[PDB]
């Protein structure tokens, strides 16, 4: 027991967690309020020999997000956290990886184009000057 000791209790319990890759707009909407304690519901549907994961955006947040799972046997992932009181702990071990994709295809690029244009605002360009500086 010391300051640098790692609380490996989470590893002992073999707690499982899911790693999800999501776009910025979904997180940006969450970052808008980020304090209401609710951003949506995660729905998982399973069949006899197939499983599908999808996420629905909150109606208030807006004012379909299908999920695709990925193999995790090629790399072993673990999640750990550092406490502000200098007490590191291991939350658990990743058991599945998922990715989020946009339901729309055509108009979705329009939102991306705005982001690319928005990120282009700091891109300064030379300005033509009508009158020579005196």
């Amino acid at each position: 027991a010391e300051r640098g000791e790692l609380d490996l209790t989470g590893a002992k319990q073999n707690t499982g967690v899911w790693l999800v890759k999501v776009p910025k707009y979904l997180s940006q909407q969450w970052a808008k309020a980020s304090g209401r304690g609710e951003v949506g519901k995660l729905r998982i549907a399973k069949t006899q020999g197939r499983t599908e994961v999808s996420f629905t955006l909150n109606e208030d947040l807006a004012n379909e997000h299908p999920f695709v799972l990925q193999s995790v046997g090629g790399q072993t992932l673990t999640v750990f956290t550092e406490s502000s009181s200098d007490k590191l702990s291991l939350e658990g071990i990743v058991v599945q990886r998922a990715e989020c994709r946009p339901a729309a295809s055509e108009n979705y690029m329009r939102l991306k184009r705005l982001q690319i244009e928005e990120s282009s605002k700091p891109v300064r360009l030379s300005q033509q000057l009508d009158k020579v500086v005196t």
Binding site: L125, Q128, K131, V133
Partner: protein, 87 residues
């Protein structure tokens, strides 16, 4: 080159840091170009037409200006930031 490369080159240049102990910084941000101008003997600027450059053996050149922000620190918990627009 004029619209992007010149501005990127100026932006990508590292700020000039100088220490005496007063400290001086120079940061170049915005690049301006005027239309090709020719200065007469009296010093009066005038637009330079390409034919006049050809006839009078002039160089068809446009003045280049850069906005320079200078910040000086004199270890006296005061910072003075003066900007020279269109240098």
């Amino acid at each position: 080159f004029i619209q992007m490369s010149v501005q990127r080159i100026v932006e990508d240049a590292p700020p000039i840091d100088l220490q005496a102990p007063p400290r001086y910084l120079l940061k170049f941000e915005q690049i301006y170009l005027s239309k090709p101008t020719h200065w007469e003997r009296d010093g009066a600027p005038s637009p330079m037409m390409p034919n006049e450059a050809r006839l009078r053996n002039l160089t068809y050149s446009a003045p280049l200006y850069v906005d320079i922000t200078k910040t000086v620190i004199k270890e006296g918990e005061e910072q003075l930031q003066t900007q020279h627009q269109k240098t």
